[PDB]
Amino acid sequence: PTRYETLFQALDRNGDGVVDIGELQEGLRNLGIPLGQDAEEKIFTTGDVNKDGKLDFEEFMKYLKDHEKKMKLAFKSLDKNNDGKIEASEIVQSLQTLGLTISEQQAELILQSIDVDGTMTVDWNEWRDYFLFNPVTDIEEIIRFWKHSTGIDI
Ligand SMILES: [Ca+2]
Ligand SMILES: [Ca+2]
Ligand SMILES: [Ca+2]
């Protein structure tokens, strides 16, 4: 969704051309996107470049685009076989290259936590859709998020 107009119009409830923090909270909660207020605030603070307390469409778009390049490099960092998809063994080996060692079952837990549809594996579109509003900037903070999200070791 790389123009992001639909998302923005979805969030701009009063249709004034900007998204306020309230609209972000109410909108994300109404769209069934589970996000904490401090993290939403992280998004807003990173995005609000002119610091007027509002997110115009170009700040919104810029944030989402840069965030999606960070997420694409993270995804390709996790993608070993270059298929365009992520399997559990790949989570295991990618984590093993980082010095972390995790079981296959915990890897399964991670994939299931990340996966929002029934695919049982995660392609670029699902990865991007999942981390769309998650203010993580790279793979290490993605790991920190996993560590809180699954409530598992490392
Ligand atoms: Ca608005
Ligand atoms: Ca602004
Ligand atoms: Ca794979």
Residue numbers in the entry: 21 to 174
Task: Reproduce, without paraphrasing, sentences from the article in which this PDB structure was first reported.
The mitochondrial ATP-Mg/Pi carrier (APC) is a member of the mitochondrial carrier family of transport proteins. APC is involved in the import of cytosolic adenine nucleotides into the mitochondrion and the export of inorganic phosphate from the mitochondrial matrix. Therefore, APC has the important role of altering the mitochondrial adenine nucleotide pool in order to adapt to changing cellular energetic demands. The N-terminal domain of APC forms a calcium-sensitive regulatory domain.
The consequence of calcium binding to the regulatory domain of APC is a stimulation of the substrate transport activity of the carrier. A structure of the regulatory domain of human APC isoform-1 has recently been solved, confirming the presence of four EF-hands, each of which is occupied by a bound calcium ion in a canonical pentagonal bi-pyramidal fashion. The EF-hands group together into two pairs, forming two lobes connected by a long central α-helix, in a similar fashion to the four EF-hands of calmodulin. The linker region between the N-terminal regulatory domain and the C-terminal carrier domain contains an amphipathic α-helix of unknown function. In the structure this α-helix is bound to EF-hand pair 3 and 4, analogous to the binding of a calmodulin recognition sequence motif to the hydrophobic pockets in the EF-hands of calmodulin. Therefore, the mechanism that couples calcium binding in the regulatory domain to substrate transport in the carrier domain has not been resolved. Here, an independent structural determination of the native human APC-1 regulatory domain was completed, which was combined with an investigation into the oligomeric state of the full-length human APC-1 protein. Furthermore, an extensive comparison of the conformations of EF-hand proteins in the calcium-free, calcium-bound and peptide-bound state was undertaken, which has allowed us to propose a mechanism for the regulation of APC that is consistent with all available experimental data.
